[PDB]
Design a protein around this ligand. Sequence first.
Ligand SMILES: [Mg+2]
Ligand SMILES: [Mg+2]
Length: 290
Amino acid sequence: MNDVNRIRTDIINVAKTFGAEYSEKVLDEVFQVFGEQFADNSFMIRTSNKQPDKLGCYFRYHEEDESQLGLAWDIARKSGLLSDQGRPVDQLIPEICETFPIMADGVDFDVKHGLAKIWQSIKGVVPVQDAFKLSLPASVTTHSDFLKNHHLDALYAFGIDYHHSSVNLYFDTYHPKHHTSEYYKNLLQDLQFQPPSDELLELLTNNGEIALTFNFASPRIERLCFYLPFLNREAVPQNLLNPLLKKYINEAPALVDNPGFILGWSFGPQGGKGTYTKVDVDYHGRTVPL
Ligand SMILES: [Mg+2]
Ligand SMILES: [Mg+2]
């Protein structure tokens, strides 16, 4: 309705204000197909820190209505927003749906390049080894011992990245160690990843979500990400945010007066590529309170 145009307008305004590359033609094509899904579902607009002087911009939605599960992938394929090119990643969503009961799915979009990722949430958690029969990067299986040792073995969701041919695995933080700062410090050390600030370590004892990234091109775990919810702009730890991300916290568009946020901290190899911050506004006001 007005609601879809409202959302599309806000994304463009975000991209223009914060210096993100964007394509109106790609935004037009995405919204023609998924516009109503954005208005009717949990929906977030994300900016991130991947390059020092400009924020990238992404938008994503999460579908939990049982009757609609599977439609995102079917819609994406039939419309041509997602073509399978025989990539090892192109077979994973059908394998996942044939293997596990799915309780939610979602799609991530890049404002420049379009459909980027599809998520599938399992109905329950499974031992991660139950997933080893999927056509996942071989690095998932070869880290089975590491995943056990760090209690990253209660799997509940997959993220399938079609732009980068990578897979994110999301793990339930079930263990008493997941409530200690030492666990996160030790986890990043063991991975030889960039060390976290003491401020972040203290926040991470709230546990949040953890995701690990595996790529078909690499024998190594590529990246990991910690996610924490925040009930409003004032709750966000602003000392952890560069000036552009601080401006985003104070100006991100939403349909409530004081939206919540989900921040993600991505970590990669020490002195390498994958350490940066993601900030997602709870556009409708319904995502974070849950
Ligand atoms: Mg829905
Ligand atoms: Mg958790």
